[PDB]
Structures are given as structure tokens and as C-alpha cells.
Amino acid sequence: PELPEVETVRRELEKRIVGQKIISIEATYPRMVLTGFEQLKKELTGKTIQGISRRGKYLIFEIGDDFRLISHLRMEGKYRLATLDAPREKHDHLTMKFADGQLIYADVRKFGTWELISTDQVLPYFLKKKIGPEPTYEDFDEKLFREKLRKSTKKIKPYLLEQTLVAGLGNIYVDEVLWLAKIHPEKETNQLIESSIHLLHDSIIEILQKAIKLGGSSIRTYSALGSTGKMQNELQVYGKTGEKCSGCGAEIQKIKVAGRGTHFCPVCQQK
DNA sequence: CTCTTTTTTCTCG
DNA sequence: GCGAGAAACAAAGA
Ligand SMILES: [Zn+2]
Known about the structure:
Elements: H1 3-17, E1 24-27, H2 37-44, E2 49-55, E3 58-63, E4 67-72, E5 78-82, E6 92-97, E7 102-106, E8 113-118, H3 122-129, H4 142-151, H5 156-161, H6 171-180, H7 194-213, E9 253-257, E10 260-264
Antiparallel strand pairs: 1-6, 2-3, 3-4, 4-8, 5-7, 6-7, 9-10
Helix pairs in contact: 1-7, 4-7, 6-7
Bound molecules: zinc ion.
The protein binds a DNA duplex (13 and 14 nucleotides) through loops.
Subunit structure: Monomer.
GO molecular function, one term: class I DNA-(apurinic or apyrimidinic site) endonuclease activity
Cofactor: Zn(2+)
């Protein structure tokens, strides 16, 4: 998932599990708990979920007075709320059981991670990760963004994916944002003029807030949290190879940029 | 059968 | 420090 999908999950969890006491925690894949599964089980069993937050693509469960469970879903992680008698599915790894149901984490590729840290360690954790600002008008300052782009000779798509200029874009929304901003993904950032940077900055905020409003991009639904999104119906370029650009009618092309599949319009995003 | 495809963080040179 | 490539892992498609 990217930031809009994780935000969608965050909102659903906030609505459904806040206030629930964790009765037990079980793992069939305990090695994805990077701070130690048995330690987590001992610390969190019997505690109550107080809140769910998000920073960039990270989910943050607020548990008990002092605990923060930092969850990254990476490429394929999925949460679902299930009955206590629900059958095991193949790639289920962890479950938090409550009195009336359970929260199951599944991840086919086993890339996702859990880390248990304390409340006063959350801000240092994300400083160490060097996560950039949230993609909001209030936090994403165009002036610093502009100065960083001016200084660099990185290509814009890989630099955006780093999470350091702004948090939250992954391959789908970086491709969408660069099409909306009319910028080619291989453009060296120190070649961007001020008006392009301004359109890029606003397009990042607008696309991600649109995607959040639509419940993220689900391809497809899965019975999991966040699986009823509608943003996939709004994609202009990602996965649209060979289809016609809605802006000019050129075929959308796919290339590889720094190892990643990259979808763009060659007319609207001049090299 | 092989090769390719689909977030973060490493090695290598 | 950089970029290129790939590991972590599983599955599906050519
Ligand atoms: Zn076009």
C-alpha cells in the first residue's frame, strides 16, 4: 500500500478497534516482529487499544498508556477483522484477538514488519528513518521542497520515491502525480523551473487527498480492510500501458526507471 | 524448465 | 557521499 491505502486502513481500525482489550496475541510467523515476538506478546496481552495513527506509509497502533506498535505493510500486507472461529488462510502471520473478533495480518511476500516501541521513541524513530513531511498544505512546505530539488541532480521519480522530499508516494501515485504535473519521470530535478515545482507540489497534495477521499486504490477488493476503494477507477497512467492518454490521445508508454515500472505520456510529460 | 513482474534497505565499486 | 543492482519473499504469467 501507499499513503492513501494505509490512511484508509487507519480510519477503519480507528472506528472499529479503539477501546478493545487485547485478549491474546498469536504468531505463525513471529520473525516479522523486529523487536521480538515473545516480548511483544508479554507486553501487549491484556492492554487496550487507545488509538491508531499514521506517519507516511507507517501505521501506528497506540496501545496501553505507553506502547506504540509500528506496522509497515510493505508491498502486499493486508489486515482483516475476522470472527474468532475464522479459518486460517495461507499467508496469515499474526493475530490480535479481542473478545468479539480478531485482527489478522497477512502478507504473501513476508515483507511487512512490526516494531514495538514506547511513546517517547516514536518521534526519534521517524527522524532516524529521515521521513519527509506529510503531503498536506500545512506540513509540505514548497520553499524547502524547491530548494532541495534545485540542489540535486537526481531524477525526479526516484527522488520522490525516497520519502525524504515528502512522505507517502509509491509507484502508483508517483506515476499519477508526474502525469498530472506534466513532468517526465527521468527529469533531473535541478532542471525543474519554479512554476513546474509549484504544480508538482500542489499535484502531490491533491492526488493523495483525492485518493484518501476515495478510499485508496484496490486492485482488487479482498475482504480485507481498505479493499473497497475507488481510486483505481481514476488512474490516468499507472498500469495503462498502450491505452490512450486522456489529455492528448498518445499511447501511454512503460519504461524502467531506477528499477521500477514507470508509466507516462510522452506528449504530456516531455523528456 | 527459465525469466520477468509486482517497499525498504542493503552491498558494491 | 552516488547510482546500479539486488535481497528480503511468493506467486503468476510469458
Ligand atoms: Zn498526453
